[PDB]
Design a protein around this ligand. Structure first.
Ligand SMILES: Cc1ncc(COP(=O)(O)O)c(CN[C@H](C)C(=O)O)c1O
Ligand SMILES: Cc1ncc(COP(=O)(O)O)c(CN[C@H](C)C(=O)O)c1O
Lengths: 277, 277
C-alpha cells in the first residue's frame, strides 16, 4: 500500500525511521486516529484540529498548513482504496543529535500516516463487554494526545490477560478514562463523565456523544465518579474513534445492574448513528 | 560511523527502523547511557544490569546473555574509534501492527546502539551551574528507564530558556530528581538524597557517589527534602553518567550558601576520580 511520509505519498516499502527521530528516543510527538466509513472520513475536521492543538501544546510547528494536511489525507484514502477502517497519523519534533531540550536550530517535524481495513465493532455495540479497574499511573498532561503511551500499553495488556475489552483507569479510586477511551456512567437518566482537564483526553467521540445527549435532551453532568459508584450505575459505556459507543455490562465479575445494555445507552447509540457518513 | 543493530555492528545507513516499531508509536522500550573515558567503558556491567531490569519490568526479554551484550558494546567502541564520549543503547518491544496490548505472538525486540565523542564537562565540574525548580508532572514508574520522556523534554527546555543547566523536579514541594540526573544535598556534613522508590531513577552515578561517601567516612541519609530545604543546604549537586558530579551554586537566582563549590562536594569529586578508567 501507500504511506504518507512527510508531505509525500510513497510505497509502504520506502519508509524508514531515523534512530535519532525524537519520537523514537523521547516519544516526543502527537497523533490521531480517524475512522473511515465507506470511503468517508468521520469528523476529520475535529481530528485535524486536535492534531495541530496537541502539537501547539508541546510547541511543535507542523511544517504545512491544515488545508494541505486534509488534502494529503484525502488522497491517502483514495490511493489505498480504503472502504471501512481507519487512518492513523502522527508527527514528531524531528531528527537531530540526542539531547532532551528542543533542537537549537529548528529541524523539520516528521510525519507518518497510513490506513487499515477494519469493520465496525458490531458485536460489541450490540452485546456489551467486560472491563476491569486498573490504577491510573500515567503522567499529568493526559490532555495532550502524545506518543508517551507506555502506561496505557501495560493497562490494556492487563485487561486482555483477564479477558476484558478495556481497562478502566482510576486515580485513588476516582475514575478518569480508559486505556484508550473515555468512560461514561448513567444513573436515573443522567449522563455522568469526568471533566475535560489535564487528567483525561477530551475525546472526539466523547464530544459527539455529549452533543447527541443535548440533542435528545438528556441531562449531562461533567463531574467525576469513583470506582465504587461506577459499580452501582444503572448503565455504563466507553467511547473512542474505533469503539464508538461500546456498552460495559460487567466489571471484574460484577454485573452493571442486570448485565444488560441500558435504555439510554441505546438512545445515545441511535442518535450517534445519525452522524455516521 | 557504525551502529549496533540487534547483534551486528553495521554502518549507520544500513539500519532500518519500521514505522510500527513500538518504540516509535508508544515509547514502548528502555535505554541506557554509558560514559567512555579514553576508549574504556565506565561501570558498563552496572548499566547492562539496569537495561535488563528495566526491560523485564515491562515484560521485554533481551535475547542475548549479559556477557554477549557487553562484548557487543566493546566492539562498537572500537569500530567507531571512540576516545572520550558515551554509548547510547536501547531496546524496544519490536515491530508489530499497531495495538496497545502486547503482540499476540512474541515478535523480536529491536536493539539499537551508537557512540558520540563528547568531552568531560570541565567547567561545570569546577565552577558549578545554575538550576531552576520545575513541578514534576511525570508518570509514577520513574524507576523504569523508559523512552517515555516527554515530561523531561519539557522540563529541560524550561531550564535552558532560563539560562539554567538543569531543571530540579519536585512533587508536592518535595525534590525528586533532575530532568536527566539525581539530586544531592549537603548540610552539617551529612549527605541527603531522595530514596530509590518509584518516584526516581536509581542512578548508577548516584550509587557510586553514595559508595564514595561511605569510603570517605561521610554519613548518608536517603531521605527526601523540600524546595525550602534544598535552598537552605550548605552544598548541592546533581549526578548523571554524563554530568558526573556537577555542583549547583544557584537555584532560581537564589545562591546556595555563598554561590561557591563546597568542601564535601570537592571530597566526593576527588574520591569519584579514583573510580574513573
Ligand atoms: C486515553 C484515550 N482516551 C480517549 C480516547 C478516545 O478519543 P477519541 O474519541 O478522539 O478517539 C483514546 C483513544 N484514541 C485512539 C483511538 C487510539 O489510541 O487508538 C485514548 O487514547
Ligand atoms: C531521570 C533521570 N534520573 C537520573 C539519571 C542518572 O542516572 P545515571 O547516573 O545512571 O546516568 C538520569 C540520566 N540518564 C541518561 C544520562 C540520559 O537520559 O541522558 C535520568 O534521565
Amino acid at each position: 500500500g501507500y504511506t504518507l511520509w512527510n508531505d509525500q505519498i510513497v510505497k509502504d516499502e520506502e519508509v524508514k525511521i531515523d534512530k535519532e527521530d525524537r519520537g523514537y528516543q523521547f516519544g516526543d510527538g502527537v497523533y490521531e486516529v480517524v475512522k473511515v466509513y465507506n470511503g468517508e472520513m468521520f469528523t476529520v475536521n475535529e481530528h485535524i484540529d486536535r492534531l495541530y492543538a496537541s502539537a501547539e501544546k508541546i510547541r511543535i510547528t507542523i511544517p504545512y498548513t491544515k488545508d494541505k494536511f486534509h488534502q494529503l489525507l484525502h488522497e491517502l484514502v483514495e490511493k489505498n482504496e480504503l472502504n471501512t477502517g481507519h487512518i492513523y497519523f502522527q508527527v514528531t519534533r524531528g531528527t537531530s543529535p540526542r539531547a532532551h531540550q528542543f533542537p537549537e536550530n529548528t529541524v523539520k517535524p516528521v510525519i507518518i500516516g497510513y490506513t487499515k481495513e477494519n469493520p465496525r465493532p458490531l458485536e460489541n455495540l450490540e452485546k456489551g463487554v467486560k472491563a476491569t479497574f486498573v490504577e491510573d499511573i500515567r503522567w499529568l498532561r493526559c490532555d495532550i494526545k502524545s506518543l508517551n503511551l507506555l502506561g496505557a500499553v501495560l493497562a490494556k495488556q492487563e485487561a486482555h490477560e483477564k479477558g476484558c475489552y478495556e481497562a478502566i483507569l482510576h486515580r485513588n479510586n476516582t475514575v478518569t478514562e480508559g486505556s484508550s477511551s473515555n468512560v461514561f456512567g448513567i444513573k436515573d437518566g443522567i449522563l455522568y463523565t469526568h471533566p475535560a482537564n489535564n487528567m483525561i483526553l477530551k475525546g472526539i467521540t466523547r464530544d459527539v456523544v455529549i452533543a447527541c445527549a443535548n440533542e435528545i435532551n438528556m441531562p449531562v453532568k461533567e463531574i467525576p465518579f469513583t470506582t465504587h459508584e461506577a459499580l452501582k450505575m444503572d448503565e455504563l459505556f466507553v467511547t473512542s474513534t474505533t469503539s464508538e459507543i461500546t456498552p460495559v455490562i460487567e466489571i471484574d465479575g460484577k454485573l452493571i445492574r442486570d448485565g444488560k445494555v441500558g435504555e439510554w445507552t441505546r438512545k445515545l447509540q441511535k442518535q450517534f448513528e445519525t452522524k455516521i457518513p
